[PDB]
């Protein structure tokens, strides 16, 4: 329901926008560069940058400006509070104890998978590997699960923007092979990726669905290719994922 302009705090709209203008390409910003990129006057943007410094979100040498780790607290506020991650935390730690592997819940954010929940159970198998909190879609188990639950339209939309570049020697780079896998995932109800995103990383995932059948999130086990064979991952870990799926149906 459209919000009235009397209710909009402009300093907050522009402040939050400014903070997103820091990047790998723009790690620091001067007043002139920030006025450009943001569309404000130098005099105005300087007040925003100084405000960020005073609040601890930024530092300056008096001419350049860059963000501090405090920016992480924003959005950590989202990870801590978000309903689905809080609902899925206990099952993630249970499956971590049942597998001694790294367990993750993946959701779509933009064109990537984010892992809002990663197991903190500390007894993982000797040789282990943990996925980062933000991963690409086409070469990961949770990404392919998500791609497979899109219909052809958004799929082709994603694939038009993202070209299947190889991240390891083993990455699949042919669109035809990948569509075969994507339909296999929807067929069988689970996905295994063998070292297409990261060397050593074997990942098994299952979809978690809502009552209408739509994809809400994924549940994945990451293990090291030097310990388990795919055979063993299927026989030992997949039934555990199917049990977590069933347990999670009343939570929905």
Minimum CB separation from a copy of itself for residue 178, in Å?
25
Of positions 28, 46, 89, 130, contacts ligand HCI by CB under 6 A? 130
116 binds, among a copy of itself, ligand HCI, none (CB under 5 to 8 A by kind): a copy of itself
Of positions 70, 97, 120, 165, contacts ligand HCI by CB under 6 A? 120
Minimum CB separation from ligand HCI for residue 130, in Å?
3
Contact of 221 with 102, CB cutoff 8 Å? yes
Residue 32 binds to ligand HCI (criterion: CB under 6 A): no
Residue 89 binds to ligand HCI (criterion: CB under 6 A): no
Contact of 21 with 27, CB cutoff 8 Å? no
The partner residues of 59 in beta bridges, in order of sequence, read: 66
Contact of 35 with 79, CB cutoff 8 Å? no
Provide the edge-to-edge strand list for the sheet that holds 58-60: 29-30, 64-67, 58-60
Residue 128 binds to ligand HCI (criterion: CB under 6 A): no
C-alpha to C-alpha distance for 67 and 61, rounded to whole angstroms:
12
Between 167 and 178, whose beta carbon lies closer to a copy of itself? 167
Between 27 and 132, whose beta carbon lies closer to ligand HCI? 132
Determine phi and psi for 198, rounding to 5 degrees.
-150, 135
Nearest-CB residue for ligand HCI: 130
Minimum CB separation from a copy of itself for residue 156, in Å?
21
Classify 101 as helix, strand or coil: coil
């Amino acid at each position: 329901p459209a919000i009235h302009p009397r209710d909009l705090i402009a300093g907050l709209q522009k402040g939050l926008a400014l903070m997103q203008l820091f990047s790998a390409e723009q790690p620091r910003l001067s007043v002139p560069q920030a006025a450009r990129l943001s569309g404000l006057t130098s005099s105005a943007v300087r007040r925003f940058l100084l405000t960020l410094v005073h609040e601890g979100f930024a530092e300056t040498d008096s001419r350049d400006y860059w963000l501090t780790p405090k920016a992480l607290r924003i959005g950590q506020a989202y990870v801590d509070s978000a309903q689905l991650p809080r609902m899925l935390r206990p099952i993630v730690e249970q499956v971590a104890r049942q597998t001694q592997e790294h367990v993750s819940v993946g959701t779509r954010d933009g064109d990537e998978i984010i892992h809002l929940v990663r197991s903190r159970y500390s007894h993982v198998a000797s040789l282990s590997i943990r996925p980062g909190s933000r991963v690409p879609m086409y070469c990961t188990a949770s990404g392919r699960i998500w791609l497979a639950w899109l219909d052809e339209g958004e799929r082709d939309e994603y694939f038009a923007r993202h070209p299947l570049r190889a991240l390891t020697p083993y990455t699949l780079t042919d669109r035809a092979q990948l569509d075969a896998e994507l339909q296999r995932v929807k067929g069988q109800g689970f996905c295994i990726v063998d070292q297409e995103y990261e060397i050593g990383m074997r990942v098994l995932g299952v979809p978690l669905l809502g009552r209408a059948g739509q994809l809400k999130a994924t549940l994945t086990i990451t293990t090291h290719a030097s310990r388990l064979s795919i055979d063993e991952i299927r026989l030992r870990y997949l039934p555990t994922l199917y049990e977590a799926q069933a347990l999670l149906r009343p939570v929905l």
